[PDB]
Amino acid sequence: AYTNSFTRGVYYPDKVFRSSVLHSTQDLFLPFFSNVTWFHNPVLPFNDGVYFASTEKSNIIRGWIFGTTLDSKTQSLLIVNNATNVVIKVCEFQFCNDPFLGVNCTFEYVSFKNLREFVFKNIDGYFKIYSKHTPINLVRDLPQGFSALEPLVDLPIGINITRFQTLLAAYYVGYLQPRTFLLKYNENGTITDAVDCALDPLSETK
Amino acid sequence: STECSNLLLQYGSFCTQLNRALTGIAVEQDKNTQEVFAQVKQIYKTPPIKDFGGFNFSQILPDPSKSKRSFIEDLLFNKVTFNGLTVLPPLLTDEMIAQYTSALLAGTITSGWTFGAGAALQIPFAMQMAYRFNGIGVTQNVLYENQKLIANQFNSAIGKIQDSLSSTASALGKLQDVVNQNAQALNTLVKQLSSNFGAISSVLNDILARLDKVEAEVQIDRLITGRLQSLQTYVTQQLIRAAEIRASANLAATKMSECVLGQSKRVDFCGKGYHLMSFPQSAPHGVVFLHVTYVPAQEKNFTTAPAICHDGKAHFPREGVFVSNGTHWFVTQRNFYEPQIITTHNTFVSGNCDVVIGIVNNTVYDP
Amino acid sequence: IDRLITGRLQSLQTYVTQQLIRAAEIRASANLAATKMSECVLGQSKRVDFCGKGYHLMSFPQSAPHGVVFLHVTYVPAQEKNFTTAPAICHDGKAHFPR
Amino acid sequence: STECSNLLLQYGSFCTQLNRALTGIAVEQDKNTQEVFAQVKQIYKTPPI
Amino acid sequence: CTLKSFTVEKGIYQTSNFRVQPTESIVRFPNITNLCPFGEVFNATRFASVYAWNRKRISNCVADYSVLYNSASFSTFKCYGVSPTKLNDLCFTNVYADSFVIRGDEVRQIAPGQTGKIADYNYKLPDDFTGCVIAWNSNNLDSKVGGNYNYLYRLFRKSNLKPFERDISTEIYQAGSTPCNGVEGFNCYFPLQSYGFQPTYGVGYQPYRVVVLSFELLHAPATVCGPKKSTNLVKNKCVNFNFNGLTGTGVLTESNKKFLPFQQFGRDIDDTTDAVRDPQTLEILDITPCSFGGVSVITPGTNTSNQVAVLYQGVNCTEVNVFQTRAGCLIGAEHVNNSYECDIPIGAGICASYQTSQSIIAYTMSLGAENSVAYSNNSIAIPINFTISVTTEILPVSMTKTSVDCTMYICGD
Ligand SMILES: *[C@@H]1O[C@H](CO)[C@@H](O)[C@H](O)[C@H]1NC(C)=O
Ligand SMILES: *[C@@H]1O[C@H](CO)[C@@H](O)[C@H](O)[C@H]1NC(C)=O
Ligand SMILES: *[C@@H]1O[C@H](CO)[C@@H](O)[C@H](O)[C@H]1NC(C)=O
Ligand SMILES: *[C@@H]1O[C@H](CO)[C@@H](O)[C@H](O)[C@H]1NC(C)=O
Ligand SMILES: *[C@@H]1O[C@H](CO)[C@@H](O)[C@H](O)[C@H]1NC(C)=O
Ligand SMILES: *[C@@H]1O[C@H](CO)[C@@H](O)[C@H](O)[C@H]1NC(C)=O
Ligand SMILES: *[C@@H]1O[C@H](CO)[C@@H](O)[C@H](O)[C@H]1NC(C)=O
Ligand SMILES: *[C@@H]1O[C@H](CO)[C@@H](O)[C@H](O)[C@H]1NC(C)=O
Ligand SMILES: *[C@@H]1O[C@H](CO)[C@@H](O)[C@H](O)[C@H]1NC(C)=O
Ligand SMILES: *[C@@H]1O[C@H](CO)[C@@H](O)[C@H](O)[C@H]1NC(C)=O
Ligand SMILES: *[C@@H]1O[C@H](CO)[C@@H](O)[C@H](O)[C@H]1NC(C)=O
Ligand SMILES: *[C@@H]1O[C@H](CO)[C@@H](O)[C@H](O)[C@H]1NC(C)=O
Structure with a gap:
């Protein structure tokens, strides 16, 4: 199954305050009104980068795995919420053929009623996580609206990724593409509106 | 950077003549402003009591609660809205511009065309308007017999300027475009500092850090070549733009002299209709004229003739046109219907009936 | 030699561009001078402050190196009195206005 | 050519301000034509006689 | 000199550009954390035979090496690829400490691409190796009565090692007609052999304990780095500055702005940086350029006088009689409380003149005499007389007709 992304999947692209201004930027973004895949857990491709989101009230998702093989021969990301903090490791995991839960390692780190939204990308050997959380009233779909995802971590992993999988009651996956966006910063320096310049001729005009 | 400064000296006089060109622009902006507003020798000021015969200038005269701008000038100021770059002040402040427009305006109301020709000579405003009606071929009694209506039509027409300029900025697009063109030029000049022009980096100290002495100079000379072409392009563009503003300031200085200080007989120069007078108001980077004009507004068809024949003599109107109401013949002034009986005073003779194509037979009265 | 060609060529392009813009300022002044000779010298202008200050009577052309000098002759009213005044006068029940 | 175009980007705003300048020339020719001829609000017509 | 003239006419002339120079340098960086354990690693419990040299890996920490040469405890010290005093500034993808025991005559061999039986047969280093040998005499520990035979090195090989070729092969080296059979004898030898360390040995035979630091930088980004200094935070003065690697020249000032927790820099509409968060005490600083502007000289012309006044255009007088105009700081002219016609312009309604004991004066220009026109609804003024x-x-009408021969200006002959 698939669902419309609407105007969601924008994130703060850089560590810069800007205010009362419209800023043009070129980066990997989820294009406006693109369809995204919907789920109620295959190994997915990673492509250039990923938008991941879920509708939640129960905390049934617990993490993700990322890599090239996602298996044994090389170092690979394990990300888990331990029900107290986020925990991250990059080990050469001889992992099982599917997720499991309590229900060599070069590096490690430690930190329906809601939407949880995330973006994952890897550039020049740094893995980026951005996220946002909000209450919701809609059941089946990504809520038509706008808010921007903020950086959580910026990890110097030095590791490649081409595939990933979910660890875990409904969730969505879409892919970033190289796009030009115009982003509106208000007087508090938050992004409050956006335009996907290639969407249609009015978006080019704006 | 001293390492760049020593390379820039090899290009010689180029850097000096850019300042000389921009200084020629900057000095001229004060000359453009001076020659528009400073046409008045003395700061004339209004009587304390506003006895202008029903005409109401309170919207365009100074307000002491306002800078001393008029009410309409305060609307006009609301509707218009660093790497070695500097902006310089104008010589005349916005308060001095508003004192010149005050003097031009109070001279015009209290003394008519006379303060342009020499000393201001007072005349009552209703009589000044009566002699501005003679300038358009309408006899002065047409004003005094209609003075209350002519005053209401003027007061109402100024009220529509307040509503128009309160409700939309769109009329000020000429002044706002001059702000926008100067902003777009400086935004471009500054953003051209980030460009490489083929150098390894656009950051000058980054070139000095990455490279050895002689290798760096060959890359710094690319930033010098591109930044010099970038600044020459901006100065050449401002010279072409200043020549367009100077042509507009020479036109504004001409409308100050001919529309405000006088009464122009030039068609469509001081607005459409037959010109009576106009009032200057200041605006950011420009001038606004309120051109007051007589427009004829209701009409009837009349039968007409080039001349009338009395006892063999062909009579022509001195100052007027002959017309018939269907059964009688009259002479009128041309720009307002006011019939008079045809007489030996209203007309002049020239020869027998037979020469004129279309003459008519009627009695000329001899008082 | 190609550095000297590139710099001398840009130095000459800059001069010719300044002269093109400057010659247009002199053309605007030459068109104004041609207009003042038609309107002020060959006629009697009624355009306020066009042919000098005061009411224009006539003007005379004199040549100068690279230009023209106009000697504008004007009437200026010079001494004045206040008077009482009225827009019309009333006679045998009827209003008279000055012709 | 893309191999040339990606070098031309290193010159920054020179190309954008040339396209903007010639568009300024081009729009002004339609202004000039309306200043001269469009001085009349109605299409007046001569009578048949 | 600006005019290339000995006579100067009445006017205002721009002669120079003023510029406030950076008075000092500010540096600011994060609070320092996670110091690398080198002083504990140099006190490790264990050592290895040099054919099986033992490596400890170092990552995710900030590095100081200065103790390793500021302390005279080490009987030998050498460094390669980088100078020992510079290492405390630098960053690496990986860091390692490599450990072994050998006689004092062989510690000299351990160098980038160099020869000697320990380098050539036990611990070979590449020609681009970056690292330091730190070593100390251990005759009090590693030597034994009757000799210590627990330490071994490779004495025999058919050819020299490649970089980090940790060869632990052990078959008999045959040196003649004797077949090997895994046993030593006449012209047949085990490839690993011992120094036999005795406490009575001479200093070239005595054992040294060695730690060689080894440093590595790759396509993957750094995990070990040097610490950094920081200064007092000097507001309201012109400085050079650096925050977390954002360099510039300016005056730093307090601000009302509220950067989101991840935001570190603030930018103007032209992308030009105009605020920063301090990394140590999280105030937001507005950045403003150090002041600059044209210097102009006001002169009544040298025909009349040699006095002058000078205007620092757009400058506030704090930054340079002295008078603050809205056009900039004016020096050498009296502020006069009258008003006159504008003799020499300055800006924003101010003009200057030379007048009466004579001095240059600066005043607000007067637009003309005030005049109440004697208006009344029945009074007219009529001129009795005329002039x-x-x-x-x-009016200028024509330029001088210059023409320039382009190929003779550019080239000629
Ligand atoms: C994988 O990582 C290595 C790290 O050196 C890099 O050389 C390589 O380009 C990456 N990509 C692939 C597809 O191997
Ligand atoms: C900026 O944030 C403050 C609270 O920190 C708020 O009072 C203010 O209204 C915000 N500004 C805007 C334009 O919303
Ligand atoms: C002029 O207009 C104001 C209101 O705009 C009014 O109060 C005043 O009485 C008027 N004066 C005359 C002379 O009409
Ligand atoms: C004048 O005459 C024409 C022809 O009879 C008629 O169309 C028109 O309405 C009349 N009135 C005016 C004001 O033109
Ligand atoms: C024409 O003028 C005479 C003037 O006395 C008047 O009596 C008559 O009513 C007027 N109108 C017509 C249609 O004749
Ligand atoms: C107008 O035209 C008619 C018919 O051609 C002619 O009889 C008449 O003389 C002309 N002139 C006037 C004033 O009617
Ligand atoms: C006008 O009057 C003359 C005599 O004065 C006469 O001959 C002529 O026929 C008259 N014309 C008309 C149209 O009545
Ligand atoms: C006209 O009369 C007024 C009032 O008495 C007086 O102030 C003014 O000076 C007089 N002007 C002339 C020219 O006599
Ligand atoms: C940095 O350390 C100092 C001294 O302990 C402390 O005052 C300051 O608040 C610390 N800053 C941060 C952001 O932790
Ligand atoms: C000049 O600078 C001082 C010191 O910052 C300040 O007190 C004063 O208000 C400034 N004045 C102007 C007009 O800038
Ligand atoms: C100028 O005049 C004002 C008002 O009388 C006064 O405050 C000031 O002290 C005077 N002197 C100077 C040099 O400004
Ligand atoms: C008019 O002015 C002239 C000088 O311009 C003088 O000779 C003459 O006497 C004056 N006449 C009167 C009436 O003032």
């Missing part, structure tokens, strides 16, 4: 007036008006 004929003659006015001179002057």
Whole structure:
């Protein structure tokens, strides 16, 4: 199954305050009104980068795995919420053929009623996580609206990724593409509106 | 950077003549402003009591609660809205511009065309308007017999300027475009500092850090070549733009002299209709004229003739046109219907009936 | 030699561009001078402050190196009195206005 | 050519301000034509006689 | 000199550009954390035979090496690829400490691409190796009565090692007609052999304990780095500055702005940086350029006088009689409380003149005499008399007809 992304999947692209201004930027973004895949857990491709989101009230998702093989021969990301903090490791995991839960390692780190939204990308050997959380009233779909995802971590992993999988009651996956966006910063320096310049001729005009 | 400064000296006089060109622009902006507003020798000021015969200038005269701008000038100021770059002040402040427009305006109301020709000579405003009606071929009694209506039509027409300029900025697009063109030029000049022009980096100290002495100079000379072409392009563009503003300031200085200080007989120069007078108001980077004009507004068809024949003599109107109401013949002034009986005073003779194509037979009265 | 060609060529392009813009300022002044000779010298202008200050009577052309000098002759009213005044006068029940 | 175009980007705003300048020339020719001829609000017509 | 002239006419002339120079340098960086354990690693419990040299890996920490040469405890010290005093500034993808025991005559061999039986047969280093040998005499520990035979090195190989070729092969080296059979004898030898360390040995035979630091930088980004200094935070003065690697020249000032927790820099509409968060005490600083502007000289012309006044255009007088105009700081002219016609312009309604004991004066220009026109609704002024007036008006009509021969200006002959 698939669902419309609407105007969601924008994130703060850089560590810069800007205010009362419209800023043009070129980066990997989820294009406006693109369809995204919907789920109620295959190994997915990673492509250039990923938008991941879920509708939640129960905390049934617990993490993700990322890599090239996602298996044994090389170092690979394990990300888990331990029900107290986020925990991250990059080990050469001889992992099982599917997720499991309590229900060599070069590096490690430690930190329906809601939407949880995330973006994952890897550039020049740094893995980026951005996220946002909000209450919701809609059941089946990504809520038509706008808010921007903020950086959580910026990890110097030095590791490649081409595939990933979910660890875990409904969730969505879409892919970033190289796009030009115009982003509106208000007087508090938050992004409050956006335009996907290639969407249609009015978006080019704006 | 001293390492760049020593390379820039090899290009010689180029850097000096850019300042000389921009200084020629900057000095001229004060000359453009001076020659528009400073046409008045003395700061004339209004009587304390506003006895202008029903005409109401309170919207365009100074307000002491306002800078001393008029009410309409305060609307006009609301509707218009660093790497070695500097902006310089104008010589005349916005308060001095508003004192010149005050003097031009109070001279015009209290003394008519006379303060342009020499000393201001007072005349009552209703009589000044009566002699501005003679300038358009309408006899002065047409004003005094209609003075209350002519005053209401003027007061109402100024009220529509307040509503128009309160409700939309769109009329000020000429002044706002001059702000926008100067902003777009400086935004471009500054953003051209980030460009490489083929150098390894656009950051000058980054070139000095990455490279050895002689290798760096060959890359710094690319930033010098591109930044010099970038600044020459901006100065050449401002010279072409200043020549367009100077042509507009020479036109504004001409409308100050001919529309405000006088009464122009030039068609469509001081607005459409037959010109009576106009009032200057200041605006950011420009001038606004309120051109007051007589427009004829209701009409009837009349039968007409080039001349009338009395006892063999062909009579022509001195100052007027002959017309018939269907059964009688009259002479009128041309720009307002006011019939008079045809007489030996209203007309002049020239020869027998037979020469004129279309003459008519009627009695000329001899008082 | 190609550095000297590139710099001398840009130095000459800059001069010719300044002269093109400057010659247009002199053309605007030459068109104004041609207009003042038609309107002020060959006629009697009624355009306020066009042919000098005061009411224009006539003007005379004199040549100068690279230009023209106009000697504008004007009437200026010079001494004045206040008077009482009225827009019309009333006679045998009827209003008279000055012709 | 893309191999040339990606070098031309290193010159920054020179190309954008040339396209903007010639568009300024081009729009002004339609202004000039309306200043001269469009001085009349109605299409007046001569009578048949 | 600006005019290339000995006579100067009445006016205002721009002669120079003023510029406030950076008075000092500010540096600011994060609070320092996670110091690398080198002083504990140099006190490790264990050592290895040099054919099986033992490596400890170092990552995710900030590095100081200065103790390793500021302390005279080490009987030998050498460094390669980088100078020992510079290492405390630098960053690496990986760091390692490599450990072994050998006789004092062989510690000299351990160098980038160099020869000697320990380098050539036990611990070979590449020609680009970056690292330091730190070593100390251990004759009090590693030597034994009757000799210590627990330490071994490779004495025999058919050819020299490649970089980090940790060869632990052990078959008999045959040196003649004797077949090997895994046993030593006449012209047949085990490839690993011992120094036999005795406490009575001479200093070239005595054992040294060695730690060689080894440093590595790759396509993957750094995990070990040097610490950094920081200064007092000097507001309201012109400085050079650096925050977390954002360099510039300016005056730093307090601000009302509220950067989101991840935001570190603030930018103007032209992308030009105009605020920063301090990394140590999280205030937001507005950045403003150090002041600059044209210097102009006001002169009544040298025909009249040699006095001058100078205007620092757009400058506040704090930054340079002295008078603050809204056009900039004016020096050498009196502020006069009258008003006159504008003799020499300055800006924003201010003009200057030379007048009466004479001095240069600066005043607000006067637009003309005030005049109440004697208006009344029944009074008229009529001129009794006239004057004929003659006015001179002057217009330029033509330039001098220059023409330039382009190939003779550019080249010629
Ligand atoms: C994988 O990582 C290595 C790290 O050196 C890099 O050389 C390589 O380009 C990456 N990509 C692939 C597809 O191997
Ligand atoms: C900026 O944030 C403050 C609270 O920190 C708020 O009072 C203010 O209204 C915000 N500004 C805007 C334009 O919303
Ligand atoms: C002029 O207009 C104001 C209101 O705009 C009014 O109060 C005043 O009485 C008027 N004066 C005359 C002379 O009409
Ligand atoms: C004048 O005459 C024409 C022809 O009879 C008629 O169309 C028109 O309405 C009349 N009135 C005016 C004001 O033109
Ligand atoms: C024409 O003028 C005479 C003037 O006395 C008047 O009596 C008559 O009513 C007027 N109108 C017509 C249609 O004749
Ligand atoms: C107008 O035209 C008619 C018919 O051609 C002619 O009889 C008449 O003389 C002309 N002139 C006037 C004033 O009617
Ligand atoms: C006008 O009057 C003359 C005599 O004065 C006469 O001959 C002529 O026929 C008259 N014309 C008309 C149209 O009545
Ligand atoms: C006209 O009369 C007024 C009032 O008495 C007086 O102030 C003014 O000076 C007089 N002007 C002339 C020219 O006599
Ligand atoms: C940095 O350390 C100092 C001294 O302990 C402390 O005052 C300051 O608040 C610390 N800053 C941060 C952001 O932790
Ligand atoms: C000049 O600078 C001082 C010191 O910052 C300040 O007190 C003063 O208000 C400034 N004045 C102007 C007009 O800038
Ligand atoms: C100028 O005049 C004002 C008002 O009387 C006064 O405050 C000031 O002290 C005077 N002197 C100077 C040099 O400004
Ligand atoms: C008019 O002015 C002239 C000088 O311009 C003088 O000779 C003459 O006497 C004056 N006449 C009167 C009536 O003032």
